[PDB]
Design a protein around this ligand. Sequence first.
Ligand SMILES: NC(=O)c1ccccc1
Lengths: 316, 234
Amino acid sequence: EADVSSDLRKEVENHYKLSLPEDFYHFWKFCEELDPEKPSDSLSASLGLQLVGPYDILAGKHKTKKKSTGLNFNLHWRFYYDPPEFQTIIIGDNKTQYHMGYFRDSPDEFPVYVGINEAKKNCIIVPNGDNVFAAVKLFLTKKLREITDKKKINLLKNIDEKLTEAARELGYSLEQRTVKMKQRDKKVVTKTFHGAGLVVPVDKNDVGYRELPETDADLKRICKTIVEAASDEERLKAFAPIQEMMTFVQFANDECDYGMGLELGMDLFCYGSHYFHKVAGQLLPLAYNLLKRNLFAEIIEEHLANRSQENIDQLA
Amino acid sequence: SKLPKPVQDLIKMIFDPIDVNYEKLKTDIKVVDRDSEEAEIIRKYVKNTHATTHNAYDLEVIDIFKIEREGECQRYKPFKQLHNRRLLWHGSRTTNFAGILSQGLRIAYMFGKGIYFADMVSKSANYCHTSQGDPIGLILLGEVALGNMYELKHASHISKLPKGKHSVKGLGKTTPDPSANISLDGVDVPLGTGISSGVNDTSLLYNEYIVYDIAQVNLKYLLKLKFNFKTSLW
Ligand SMILES: NC(=O)c1ccccc1
């Protein structure tokens, strides 16, 4: 529907090995209307936002860089707490590492919504509309509730008018939670530490998921002790509840409740300590492969082997 | 203590002097000769039935013991008449084996209050709860008189078996190749490598076997296993 060629779509989607929803392409064409020379930067002066990630490929920024020479889009603008489900498309304030990304429960599916995270604050992912028009509209509306500078306010209200009309013509909801998101949230089996929810198939016999034997609050206490341990011996002791839960994940896998191991590995990734990288590097690849979500197994293994806090632009 | 050294080390691991603790087990324990046929069979069973999704460790056989619990053969005798008798794995935490050997396997895990067995060594090995710094476990081989199996593809809490049935089999997607089954002292040993079971809509990766009468079990071997973990813990 958007006026982007088949060839340019395949360039974006074959590099990421993910399809992009149509609002991705429509929004690019909107930003070109905003600034034909540099559409990626059309929101920078007004909102402090820049389009990146798959938008870098639409922009032609990847030209003269190849896979052979070290180009890995699985890590491109992948911030420290971005799980495989989360694909960055927009960056904001560098002080908080604010950014937005498409959230996919499965590589075989279109994104459920646009989530945001401030990677210098925490691992929390917040839903922010189901398409990028909504996500930027909601951000803009919030900025308008925070400022009184009349010049900036008039700039934002113009962009708001343009964005709102474009989304209405295309049929994109500007609500923070849409029907699509509400239906997906009824299939969430656990929030996980990042709060954005985990979705795995659960059949008529309730096969597919089972809970962890610790509350989230108590698992965080366990992780804290592992981090604060003062020697190898102390740390092995503090790891005992984790090893126990990893054993129970094995039983759950044998009975096709693959979501339990996905949840444990995700929470350990979300906690952030490098002390969890080897255990999450066992739990998550196996869970994703058992769930036929192979691309996410590939992402998590590459990201844990190179989990950078500040040099994540593959095109710099 | 005139007990062989491997037996003495087993006693130390499970728990007075050694020969007095040995008596508490009410079990005859002998070392299987590394060059015997029993040892060949048992090591092949271990080698062939490590599942592909249990990839955190490899298993190394340290010692194999032949065990006979006091009174158990007599207790099992009426069930020896039943068809479908199979040699199966059962793992448990090391701290349970004192009671397991003295009292036998007991009844209080998703098919109710029963005694559980697997035909994949690594499935049972996981119930040892061994750890990176605690890498030695114990696993049993038991003769199980399964008879008429109640075959299931997902969890059911069984108060009682359906009339005519003697045990429950959870159907795995993967099964030891039945063409490789062998017979050992009147027991079927399913020691072939795993192939597809052809079971179409089951929610278990590997078989489970459950019996609901403690007399349906005759423990035959006890193995001491080294868990060689493939990566460090952190
Ligand atoms: N204790 C065991 O080895 C076991 C086997 C199968 C199922 C559950 C437990």
